[PDB]
Amino acid sequence: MYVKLISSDGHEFIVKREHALTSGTIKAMLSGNEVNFREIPSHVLSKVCMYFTYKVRYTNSSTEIPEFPIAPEIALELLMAANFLD
Amino acid sequence: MYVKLISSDGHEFIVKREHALTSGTIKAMLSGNEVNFREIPSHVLSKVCMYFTYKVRYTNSSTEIPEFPIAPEIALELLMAANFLD
Amino acid sequence: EIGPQLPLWAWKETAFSINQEPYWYSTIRLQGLMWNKRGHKLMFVKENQGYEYWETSGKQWKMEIRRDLDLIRNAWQYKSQGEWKTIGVWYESPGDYKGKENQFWFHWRIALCSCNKTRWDIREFMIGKHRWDLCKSCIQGEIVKNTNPRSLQRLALLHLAKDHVFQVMPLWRARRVTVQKFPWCRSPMGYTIPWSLQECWEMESIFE
Amino acid sequence: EIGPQLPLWAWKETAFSINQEPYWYSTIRLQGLMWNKRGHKLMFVKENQGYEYWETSGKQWKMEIRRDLDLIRNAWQYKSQGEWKTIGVWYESPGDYKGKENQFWFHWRIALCSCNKTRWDIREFMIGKHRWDLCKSCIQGEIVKNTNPRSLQRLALLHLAKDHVFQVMPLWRARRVTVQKFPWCRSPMGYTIPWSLQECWEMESIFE
Amino acid sequence: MDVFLMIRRHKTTIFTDAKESSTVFELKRIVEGILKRPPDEQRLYKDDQLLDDGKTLGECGFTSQTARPQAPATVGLAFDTFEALCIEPFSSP
Amino acid sequence: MDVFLMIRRHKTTIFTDAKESSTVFELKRIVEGILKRPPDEQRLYKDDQLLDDGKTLGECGFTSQTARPQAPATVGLAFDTFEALCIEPFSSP
Amino acid sequence: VNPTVFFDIAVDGEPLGRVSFELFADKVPKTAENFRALSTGEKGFGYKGSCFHRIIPGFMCQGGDFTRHNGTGGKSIYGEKFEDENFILKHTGPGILSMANAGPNTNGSQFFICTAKTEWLDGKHVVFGKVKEGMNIVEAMERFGSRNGKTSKKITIADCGQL
Amino acid sequence: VNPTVFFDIAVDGEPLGRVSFELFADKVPKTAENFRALSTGEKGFGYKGSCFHRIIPGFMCQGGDFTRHNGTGGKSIYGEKFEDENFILKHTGPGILSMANAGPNTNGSQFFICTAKTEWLDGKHVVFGKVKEGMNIVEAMERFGSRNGKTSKKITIADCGQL
Ligand SMILES: [Zn+2]
Ligand SMILES: [Zn+2]
């Protein structure tokens, strides 16, 4: 139902499992509760957590699809966690 | 009902008036029975008489419209009477 | 040798997998070379509640207008006889296309060719003259303009004007105008494999 | 003077009624001059129950087939993933057009540009590199090919690849192939005013 | 499906249209208003064989394809290479 | 028209979705399964004004436009520039 | 200052049109004077009665063989043949007049008119004339050509003279 | 036989690519030797560290001012400036290398590469080189140009030498 995520500095999150299976690494770890990350920044983790709900909610509907707001500064290190997670 | 046409050599034809009003000169002469032509060849007149019925019959229908058979030799003097008639 | 008849036989390379090098690539090259600086061009004049063009011909004019409406398209109304007609924006079936706007393209193709299209002089073709100056597609347009739609003068003249050769006009031609959008010509019969005798006999001329 | 910067300022005539001579006619002339001997071309190979083309790229292939059916049209099936898809013969509404064949034109535009589209090297963009060699439309195609359709890698990379300049490809380009008919491209968004970020994020790559 | 027919005599021709199912009685009526003669002196001829009044054009051999307006057939009348030749007086005042 | 809300305490955040017409009783039930505490020690706070149990989110000020998933709002809990800060113990075995 | 010449074309009997050529004399006197003398025919022999023996559509039209009428002839007022001239002038698109020679320094009387932007006609032939009026006539003549150079009909020059 | 040279491009720090030029020495020894000597830099001064000061997109790219870096410089091994050379060679499309001079007989060290079929660059400049490998690099450099010739970023040459 609920899975646990740990950031680099200790930022700890709880995520619904339906959104949790979206990530390949999370799916692999759960298939093989509590998930720990070592180098993922807290702000980057907070930004990437919301994309799971954004994708799940708008998976079927394609009416407007508002643009995802990404700052130019944060996009450089967003891929840092995006590649590792997926 | 029926109008009379006379060729150069005496070839005399009878034409239904509905087809007769197609020609401008014939219409003008009838508006102002018997119509006489001086320089119209007999063969050219015979060829041009059939075009009246060809146009009247196929005025509305446009299904196939088969090509009108004109010999290359006769086309030079066909215009001779075509211009005078129209 | 006898003259300058070298051209690009040595400079032609192709041969990747196209094969049949003569008469295929050389024909396209000659067609492209001939149609570079031959013909007229569209030009923009006047502007009241709409963009207007009238081309640069001097003998066979053609007026086109485009309004500011159709915010996502192409109306491109053109003047025929005494009224404006819409070229078209979208047709449900190809049958509705071929039969509703062929009049525009037929006159557009002729109006671009550079020929002496003045002094029709109906006294020609009367004593055995053929008027070899005009092309196959130009004399047909002159006949359409100067003859009643279905009388016995579009038929005899067309028969007498069959020996004229036809010049292939490429699809990339009739373009490169100042207009950045232009209507799309979804019809190749007007430029290649020219109009049959049965279609020029039932066409209404734009001019009045 | 300082260099060869004369060009055709004196040789430019125009001035009929177009006006605004600088930056309008010169832009079109430069666009035409640049796109003459730049890019690849279509070529014909193999023939079994159909005409097949695969172009000359060497790194980003594209297979197209055309059967002998459609006796008056254009089927022009092309291979995507592992199946053949029909480009289209006639669409009732413009909405059915934009959304059913944009995948073909998007990959066709990129496959014609001449660039080093090998060694993607995902280790790039990792230590502060931008890969300035590729164009705006080429890096987008590389990202589409090498990324999952909706993961967080088509989005970050697109944001990091926004500074690249876009080259305007004329409509008369992507043509002049050996095929005498070709499909008609009723879409200008792929060649001018390029694709938005919201449309490259939901596109499936042809390659598998 | 109109069938166009001709009656060519001496130098003149008379052209008309009818139906394949239509009999020759109306064809005779057509020439009644031309020659101004009772229906006794006229006998329709087809090729070189006698044509009777009681048989319609449907089985006589006339077909729309072979009697097209571009080339109508000719039957003639009486009182390829060659055909009949006779006389015809003009209408009297 | 789901409304997405956040409860950010000390260093962690809890994110959830609900309805504008939905009351805060189910919101309290959500944290019941997280803090494992009876519905007496928790009092929802909105901005700097006390929030009661008997008033739903429809008239509380929450709107779908202002509570979009791109930027969900935060309310917090108790036992811009600055907000509340408190402690939270982990679950005991 | 610059001399001009006029030609009348006839395609199998009935005439087709009239064309006017302008000859550059200041930049090259020799070939311009030779062409003018051959056209006006003050030494008996002239360009009158010749025939365009080869036309390449969209490419060019060659003619000027008044002796053999087969493309193997050639003559000039100076002599049977002369040598080349300056190559200052260059082809500037369609409707440009230039002498045609089988080989280097072999310029006789076979000229040709180019109706295309041919850039590779450099360093081999001398260009000296340009059409003033009658480009449509040139197109009409060239429309009767063929790839092999054979002419479907006989295109001849009816009259020659200097304005 | 024909000498060849290589250039390494850098656009604002990180390198972009490598290009190779082939120099025609048999047809013209003077300018080819001058360019080779300037590129390899055996007299101290060289092409290393220069900057492409003007790019016209779809038209050309000029550079080679290692003294002033403003387009007003110029130097050569023979001297400050020399006179022209033979004009046998002609432009044959994109990616062709030719020296650029402000006026006649004023060839210094400012060269330029043309990436278009420019036919009017005749009789004014001497063309001596052609790109062997790296045309995509030339396009990438030229894509950063502008109509006025201003460059949005600094495109420099990092290394020079002879193979
Ligand atoms: Zn014409
Ligand atoms: Zn590219």
Side-chain angles (χ1 to χ4, degrees), chain C residues 38 109-110 113-115 117 133-138 167, chain G residues 143:
Chain C
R38 212 167 87 86
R109 193 259 167 272
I110 308 161
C113 200
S114 60
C115 294
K117 300 180 289 283
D133 184 17
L134 307 181
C135 314
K136 181 176 181 179
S137 200
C138 303
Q167 292 217 301
Chain G
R143 222 179 296 109

Side-chain angles (χ1 to χ4, degrees), chain G:
Chain G
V1 181
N2 295 318
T4 184
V5 75
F6 85 100
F7 275 50
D8 298 334
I9 320 291
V11 174
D12 216 0
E14 58 159 338
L16 189 146
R18 183 162 168 279
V19 287
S20 50
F21 303 89
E22 185 265 300
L23 303 190
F24 295 124
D26 48 355
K27 277 163 208 267
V28 59
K30 191 171 182 179
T31 191
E33 184 75 15
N34 173 37
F35 192 65
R36 180 201 72 97
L38 284 181
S39 197
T40 191
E42 80 285 348
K43 264 85 173 178
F45 44 96
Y47 271 130
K48 178 184 209 169
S50 79
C51 176
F52 280 57
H53 61 84
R54 58 186 307 266
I55 304 159
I56 313 296
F59 180 32
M60 61 79 71
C61 300
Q62 185 190 321
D65 198 354
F66 57 95
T67 52
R68 311 212 158 280
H69 315 298
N70 276 4
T72 75
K75 216 166 63 181
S76 167
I77 62 170
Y78 314 111
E80 190 277 331
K81 268 161 190 295
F82 44 82
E83 61 86 20
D84 281 326
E85 271 306 285
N86 54 3
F87 285 76
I88 301 170
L89 283 76
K90 216 181 290 304
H91 302 250
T92 55
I96 198 162
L97 178 55
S98 49
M99 300 266 257
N101 52 3
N105 296 295
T106 319
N107 320 319
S109 167
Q110 269 168 66
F111 64 94
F112 80 95
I113 308 159
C114 182
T115 69
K117 186 185 176 180
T118 52
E119 65 183 1
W120 52 268
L121 277 296
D122 288 342
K124 279 87 173 177
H125 320 288
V126 186
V127 56
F128 70 104
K130 189 178 73 174
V131 287
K132 187 163 285 167
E133 293 179 353
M135 187 66 204
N136 47 73
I137 301 309
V138 178
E139 291 151 275
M141 293 183 286
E142 184 178 1
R143 222 179 296 109
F144 284 87
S146 59
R147 176 60 77 78
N148 310 119
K150 300 301 289 185
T151 48
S152 54
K153 289 185 180 185
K154 297 182 188 295
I155 297 90
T156 69
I157 301 152
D159 189 358
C160 305
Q162 177 164 17
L163 310 183

Side-chain angles (χ1 to χ4, degrees), chain D residues 113 115 135 138:
Chain D
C113 200
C115 294
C135 314
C138 303

